């Protein structure tokens, strides 16, 4: 979807790069699918039962995984996305894995529209819409 | 000795008295040291049973509640 180029071009880039390797004696040029690759990392988290969330972007797509993640999920994880980069590279989808404590360290809030955070009793914030 | 309000009720009393030993309570919570004050607090009040622990350490201008009858001891 995103490469526009003609049998002529494609047949002078294919040149170029046998040009910059001199040990190969051809290289060939293959069209690949991104909803497939995207549906192959979605399908491998679901697989591993990780807790996700997706975003997407013009020409990328970036799956955020946080929290208070436990070890075997830690491991799990950490194969996975290890396995699928040898695959697809990092150019198109990128994993950001995220280890942190619980929200706000535990003080109580409201998190409507009109949210704020509870200090200590008697003691309000209203720093943002929660 | 001022005579310049008369009070409409019960907690218009109470409040007024009240406020006049401020100086004195002052001077008393200049000198004690809180955590005994506090201890002491809790304990009149059956709370919890009487000793509970905390998870969280939350300061609630604390020096306008206590009770003379907290403040005296710890002085």
Same mark, same amino acid.
């Given at each position: 979807?995103?490469?526009? @180029?003609?049998?002529? $071009?494609?047949?002078?880039?294919?040149?170029?790069?046998?040009? #910059? @390797?001199?040990?190969?004696?051809?290289?060939?040029?293959?069209?690949?699918? +991104?909803?497939?690759?995207?549906?192959? &990392? $979605?399908?491998? #988290?679901?697989?591993?039962? #990780?807790?996700?969330?997706?975003?997407?972007?013009?020409?990328?797509?970036?799956? !955020?995984?946080?929290?208070?993640? +436990?070890? !075997?999920?830690?491991?799990? &994880?950490?194969?996975?996305?290890?396995?699928?980069?040898?695959?697809?590279?990092?150019?198109?989808?990128?994993? &950001? %894995? $995220?280890?942190? +404590? +619980?929200? #706000?360290?535990?003080?109580?809030?409201?998190?409507?529209? $009109?949210?704020? %955070?509870? @200090?200590?009793?008697?003691?309000?914030?209203?720093?943002?819409?929660? | 000795?001022?005579?310049? /309000?008369?009070?409409?009720?019960?907690?218009?009393?109470?409040?007024? /008295?009240?406020?006049?030993?401020?100086? =004195?309570?002052?001077?008393?919570?200049? =000198?004690?040291?809180?955590?005994?004050?506090?201890?002491?607090?809790?304990?009149?009040?059956?709370?919890?049973?009487? *000793?509970?622990?905390?998870? /969280?350490?939350?300061?609630?201008? *604390?020096? *306008?509640?206590?009770?003379?009858?907290?403040?005296?001891?710890? =002085?």
């Amino acid at each position: 979807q995103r490469n526009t @180029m003609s049998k002529k $071009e494609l047949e002078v880039l294919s040149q170029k790069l046998r040009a #910059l @390797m001199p040990y190969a004696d051809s290289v060939n040029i293959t069209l690949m699918d +991104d909803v497939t690759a995207a549906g192959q &990392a $979605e399908a491998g #988290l679901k697989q591993q039962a #990780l807790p996700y969330s997706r975003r997407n972007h013009k020409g990328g797509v970036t799956f !955020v995984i946080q929290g208070a993640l +436990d070890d !075997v999920e830690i491991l799990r &994880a950490r194969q996975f996305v290890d396995s699928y980069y040898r695959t697809w590279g990092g150019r198109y989808v990128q994993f &950001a %894995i $995220e280890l942190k +404590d +619980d929200w #706000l360290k535990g003080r109580s809030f409201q998190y409507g529209a $009109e949210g704020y %955070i509870k @200090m200590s009793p008697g003691h309000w914030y209203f720093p943002s819409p929660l | 000795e001022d005579e310049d /309000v008369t009070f409409n009720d019960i907690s218009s009393l109470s409040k007024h /008295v009240d406020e006049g030993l401020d100086g =004195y309570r002052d001077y008393l919570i200049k =000198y004690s040291d809180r955590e005994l004050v506090q201890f002491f607090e809790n304990a009149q009040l059956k709370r919890q049973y009487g *000793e509970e622990t905390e998870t /969280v350490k939350r300061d609630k201008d *604390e020096i *306008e509640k206590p009770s003379i009858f907290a403040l005296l001891p710890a =002085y």
